[PDB]
Design a protein around this ligand. Structure first.
Ligand SMILES: O=c1[nH]c(=O)c2[nH+]cn([C@@H]3O[C@H](COP(=O)(O)O)[C@@H](O)[C@H]3O)c2[nH]1
Ligand SMILES: O=c1[nH]c(=O)c2[nH+]cn([C@@H]3O[C@H](COP(=O)(O)O)[C@@H](O)[C@H]3O)c2[nH]1
Ligand SMILES: O=c1[nH]c(=O)c2[nH+]cn([C@@H]3O[C@H](COP(=O)(O)O)[C@@H](O)[C@H]3O)c2[nH]1
Ligand SMILES: O=c1[nH]c(=O)c2[nH+]cn([C@@H]3O[C@H](COP(=O)(O)O)[C@@H](O)[C@H]3O)c2[nH]1
Lengths: 442, 442, 442, 442
């Protein structure tokens, strides 16, 4: 039928955050008891439904660390050298429990400049010393306590060098090391084989961060999860190869129109080369686009086109979809594949987040709410946000998350939701007019 | 059918006050002749459809007194010691006609400090004196006129002490006492049995407040009605027990989500222990929630979630229902039980109140409109309002009520409503756009 | 069916001026050629569809005169003494051609104070003199030209007194008198019978106002049309009796709720006593109300409740109907009776007027647009408007009318309407959103 | 059926730019590869879908030149003398390649004042000299290089006069002349027949403007396209006759209500006299109006009534149609005739343009966006805009076009549109609320 596309032009209708409210429901569950955890895949498991945007004013290593510590996930932005980005990922992966199975080491023949680089780069504060690279046999350890008395860093590890050291067998756990470090009063516990060949290193920091950040989102090895953004370019594979060597949990293929053919192609290509890699692809606003990314191999779909708070797409190109309808239409399609969606853009308040999750999104992604947080890249106080603009300095990330998560639990309480799955599946909205929205804020 | 909850997510629609207008109708009744009285139960009968909110910036004894005097009802807030709240209720119950059947008394052996406490506490200004507590036989009365000549309050009632006194038999009425007090020129008329044992006390104040506040809402004994708020906590029963000893007319079980299981439980528990007690339960926005509270034993339902003028629920949790739809959906369910609903929150103008009552609510409850009234707890002039904020100092309660009630009678006139029942049942609305609302205010 | 009133409560929907636009149509007729005349009854025929409101800040004699001169109609407001209002009507009726069939006269025995009163009261500037009241035989005429030379007004008409005078037979017309006054160079032309008994008077002013205001709306005798407001009170009949003696064309029974029984009663009563009188009754917003007023005998219906620019009805009582829907629903009912409606309130711009007339109204009524006009009661420049408020000083009425009528002709041009009947009957609207209205103004 | 027009009065609904967004679609085509060209007729072919409005604050010769150079089209406004307007058209037609087939020439007997007039008028900078008008035989050429050494312009061409000159045969092309002018180092290349009779002239400017403005919209002869506005008046034919002599590509019959009979008549009359002329007729908002203009002979239809940014039509006459619905309803009708429509008025941003083109318009017309551009008629910096108002000074036209066209290509990218035909035909919208529009801008 020739005329259908023409006749249907104005037919569709969509809703944004301010058009609706969640409707209260029978609830046996209190806000404090609800579970806010979400699984994006078996290798990607968040304790809070939050991701910081890959954007140069939002997410670099310090941020990805702070996010993961809270149960969420950072995405390292791509506006940096590939070597730089892989390095940013490595810094997040090795922040805690990173040298347990893959330790750095020095030899007596290195300078102390080498020690200070490693401790500085990874924030570890102790370094193992082996006889030689080939042998892998550990002789001595140089640490932060040792650095204090060293005036010149040009001198070799031999000079400022032992005694017997307390070392433990490989596959020693944190709770095991906790007692050893405690019994013997050490802050560093190297791990060797039966031959005394260096295998790994455990520090008290690997211990106390576990205590201090119990909701941390971590891989199986116990290291902080991290994502990274990759464009669709000739550069794409090379960059991914380097990040994968990095061990970063997920790659986000971030483009403006995710329903283009060039993007489907690249997904197909990356899935082929990395069958187990977490591939987050976006951005899409439709069910058809969502279906195409999933059949291309995306294991997560990122959603929204136009809704961003700095996004000029609507005004300049006339293009976009109201975010809740976007999330809803996408989630409707992704649901049939057991595929999670991310809600990307448009979220001003904690209530918006709750609505995004109740319209079907597994996680939400925030740029601007995080832009003035202490841990973000930038330096009353002020900090920049670009895609150009400004937002107040918000203090440490943790305070913003707490109010977000607190809003989420209250909302879950009103809806009677023990967990996010229940919410996505059971929550009902009610549409309201502009005048309906005027009371909502008071 | 597995998919119904998902498909229906965005289906519902709701209206607030500004979306609608009452439509004029055939009217034989003038605003001055209409009846604004409402019955919440046989033991709770208002002459005006207004309740002051249990809130620490709105309602304590002075307020509950002023409300009841106007035909409405105060709810003592729960942000106080239980002993304190029971005492606040007692002050309202004994404001007028309170010692008629349950008198306080002293003995010649008390000090005058005791007299000044009682007169001060209850604003009565005369105190009966009996020989002894066991005997109950009245000897003398100490009053405000007597206090003037007393310099030291440490002295006993014996010293500043009689002559024969004019006393009347129990079950003497106000209109009877009016003539006696008038014939003999006394302001105090104690009541004894045939043995001269003290039974009660009547004062001219019990008389002239009847004259001065003819619309007063009162129990069968003729004392001002009062409510009290109770949370859902381990504290709940103990607090209620004390208030019931107080004789307060109604308890309001006030929680944020009234459709939770913990709230239904507590209602069931209180109804069991107090089969005749007025239990106002809330807050709910749905018919299902309304049904559950009624079957739990609530004899009044309080409505609205999100609409409050300080309420951040909408923004922080994303949760709420547009107030008129809320009231309408609740009233639709409660109607089948012969159960009244209260409209709680969102009312800015007298016209909003009229609309709330025409959408099915029996009474409305107001926090903010009363927050700067003289009788409210706080101290140009200024007074605080929190759930933090401010509202102009409005003068005495009576002036705000008069314009509210005047708006209500005009509205009833336009709709042709002789009484509130007719209004609830017959009144029709018309929906308008935002531009429709722009003319409405001019 | 018991439940219908409850279920239908929120069903109705309504539109105001800003929700819609008139849709352009095939047009063979230019704005200058269209006819803006309207017939409210055979005795009430306007050359422009405009009425000035009976309101103390809008319409008194000066205004009713200015309106009628433009083809419209003034309504003298009722906030004045009945004698005062009848006098205001008489001033409008006698402004031009008023003493042609019912002349005032003096006798030689009156003082000149009497002459100056009459000329001053009615702005006529000549007065006939008869021998005696019984006889009616005219002797001399005293005029403005004569007053100049008179220092003391206490002196009798005898003193400052003749010669033969040029007089004409009764039923002399204006065009006849035009030539006589011209041929003989007189400004005053008395009219007598064959016996020389005074019958009427014609002046050059009666002539030149016809020239100067060709669109004037006039009765059969050629005097300016005038209306008057009457309340529903015990006062009503007495006031009407006096106005009818006045000869005022129409009475407006103006009340807040025209669908009340007391108003239907009064209409029935006035129609009975004055079978030919023009009775404008209001105000109503519904078809049912409209039907009741017509069957009570109203020959015009006035419409709108809430739309007034000073009207607080919406906010205070919650009551009203969006004006276009009001006019449309009323016009739909009145049409079946051949009955015209007036659109009363809400009109900010000339475009609103065009829309009001295209929604079915015969005429529109304006308070606020006329409030600062020179001819209005009040005294940069400033003038008050109450029902309290302010509006810029607009200059003479004629300038405001011209832009109104110019807007009306343009609108009629776009719709292809040769006359108002075509417009009412054929014009189509298109509904738009708030954003649709944002472009409309630029 | 008598009552249909009355019942349907409020039935229609319409949308403007801010009510909607284009929905992203499968896209294989990048913004840089899309084609923005449009054909209004075989003789009217634009490289960009833009027309500058015939308005005295927007388009005169300088503007029509700048527009055409960019691939768009200027319409010379009619608020000028007919001789003046024909002259403005001639200036645009002869800006480049204009004297190739119809050269101006002088004789040795003219003064230099004549030379300076021609070079000044047409910006050509060389003038051919023939022996005599009858003969047409070229003797010498006077140019800009020659003017430098001439102090007095009163002297004849004979004085300041040869040598042999390098001339080429008629039908020489630009690419041919490019090499000649290059090989011989000349900037002027006259064209003669075998007899040495002057036929045309080619300059280096005719060459380098081709290089400098590759997207230029030109006729078959290679001269810049130009339009002109004509009113509907007695003046109409005479004016058109003169413009056609001008060779201007299109005439725009511009009136306020294009659905009037006088406008259909004039179209019929002009089509009869000029069967091949491009006739752009407007303005219309309906399909019925659109059909009537096409059957009258309009080969392009211009659309919108009310949407203009200075247009008071909505407010003053109450008349208009929301622009997208207007364009859509018109395009729906015009499509059946293979007829293009122009979207005229209402466009604030590049996104609005994209939406106008996706609602079915072939081209859009802009007044206000171009009003402060350097090339516009008027003289921080400031420039006026009237239909009275102001708009910032925008710099040269080219910068505004580039952002417009860049917005258009992005939008086309999101929709997957290789060309404008695909866009018109396949693009889908989604309607949003006012709150939906609040996020769109951030
Ligand atoms: O097309 C775009 N051009 C941009 O310059 C831009 N900047 C941010 N974004 C998107 O907006 C998201 C952040 O949204 P919020 O600021 O509301 O947190 C981000 O996560 C992005 O998806 C952009 N999209
Ligand atoms: O969830 C809530 N958190 C709060 O801090 C709060 N404060 C007031 N209220 C509710 O609002 C009602 C008063 O509404 P108005 O101010 O519009 O009179 C009150 O009667 C309450 O029902 C609250 N609800
Ligand atoms: O209920 C009312 N109380 C008032 O104090 C009042 N003042 C004006 N009006 C009505 O408004 C009309 C004038 O409307 P505009 O100001 O918009 O011209 C008038 O013609 C009246 O119908 C009132 N209605
Ligand atoms: O009825 C009208 N009276 C006017 O004074 C007027 N001025 C501009 N226009 C129209 O508006 C168009 C320009 O629209 P924009 O300013 O939004 O670019 C123009 O192209 C015109 O179609 C007018 N229409």
């Amino acid at each position: 039928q020739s005329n259908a596309m023409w006749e249907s032009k104005f037919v569709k209708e969509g809703l944004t955050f301010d058009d609706v409210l969640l409707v209260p429901a029978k609830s046996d569950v209190l806000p404090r008891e609800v579970s806010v955890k979400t699984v994006l895949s078996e290798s990607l498991q968040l304790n809070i439904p939050l991701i910081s945007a890959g954007m140069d004013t939002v997410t670099e290593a310090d941020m990805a660390i702070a996010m993961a510590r809270q149960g969420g996930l950072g995405i390292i932005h791509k506006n940096m050298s590939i070597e730089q980005q892989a390095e940013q990922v490595d810094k997040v992966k090795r922040s805690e429990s990173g040298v347990i199975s893959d330790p750095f080491f020095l030899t007596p023949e290195h300078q102390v400049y080498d020690a200070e680089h490693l401790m500085g780069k990874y924030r570890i504060s102790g370094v193992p010393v082996v006889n030689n690279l080939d042998e892998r046999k550990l002789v001595g350890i140089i640490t932060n306590r040792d650095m204090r008395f060293i005036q010149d860093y040009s001198i070799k590890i031999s000079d400022v060098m032992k005694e017997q050291l307390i070392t433990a067998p490989v596959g020693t756990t944190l709770s095991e090391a906790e007692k050893i470090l405690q019994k013997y009063k050490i802050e560093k516990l190297p791990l060797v084989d039966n031959n005394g060949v260096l295998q790994g290193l455990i520090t008290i920091k690997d211990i106390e961060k576990v205590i201090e950040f119990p909701n941390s989102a971590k891989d199986k090895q116990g290291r902080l999860l991290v994502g990274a953004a990759v464009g669709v370019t000739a550069d794409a594979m090379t960059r991914i190869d380097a990040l994968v060597k990095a061990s970063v949990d997920a790659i986000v293929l971030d483009t403006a129109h995710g329903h283009s053919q060039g993007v489907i192609d690249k997904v197909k290509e990356v899935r082929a080369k990395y069958p187990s890699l977490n591939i987050i692809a976006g951005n899409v606003a439709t069910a058809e686009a969502t279906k195409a990314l999933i059949e291309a191999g995306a294991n997560v779909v990122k959603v929204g086109i136009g809704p961003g708070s700095i996004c000029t797409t609507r005004v300049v190109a006339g293009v976009g979809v109201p975010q809740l309808t976007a999330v809803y239409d996408c989630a409707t399609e992704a649901r049939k594949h057991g595929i999670p969606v991310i809600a990307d853009g448009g979220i001003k308040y904690s209530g918006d987040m709750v609505k995004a999750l109740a319209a079907g999104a597994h996680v939400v992604m925030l740029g601007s709410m995080f832009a003035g947080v202490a841990e973000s890249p930038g330096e009353r106080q002020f900090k920049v946000y670009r895609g150009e603009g400004r937002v107040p300095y918000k203090g440490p990330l943790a305070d913003t998350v707490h109010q977000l998560v607190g809003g989420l639990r209250a909302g879950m309480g009103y809806c009677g939701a023990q967990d996010l799955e229940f919410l996505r599946e059971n929550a009902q909205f009610i549409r309201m007019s502009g005048a309906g929205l005027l009371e909502s804020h008071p």
